[PDB]
Amino acid sequence: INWASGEDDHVVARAEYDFAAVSEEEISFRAGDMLNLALKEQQPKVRGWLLASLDGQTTGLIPANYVKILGKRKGRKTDRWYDEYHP
């Protein structure tokens, strides 16, 4: 998955809270962690959840309201989904 590694375009988000996956479908993260999100066009519709990667390889669901969306970032190859990410 090129969005997860940052090879493809992705959205960047910062974790607000700690989260432990309860299910195989979810991924764990710590408060302050930076995650890559799939673009709108690759996002599944699961109410309360977004598709993300913490480690660049595994992907899974995170609670949408546990992260702040920071903006879209170009691959190496609620309105913040549009703005570009400025580190």
Residue numbers in the entry: 265 to 341, 354 to 363
How does the study describe this entry?
Import of proteins into peroxisomes depends on PEX5, PEX13 and PEX14. By combining biochemical methods and structural biology, we show that the C-terminal SH3 domain of PEX13 mediates intramolecular interactions with a proximal FxxxF motif. The SH3 domain also binds WxxxF peptide motifs in the import receptor PEX5, demonstrating evolutionary conservation of such interactions from yeast to human.
To investigate the structural basis for the PEX5 W4 / PEX13 SH3 interaction, we determined the crystal structure of a PEX13 SH3 GS W4 chimera. Nevertheless, polar backbone interactions involving G335 and K336 and coordination from K304 seem important since they are conserved from PEX13 FxxxF to PEX5 W4 (colored lines).
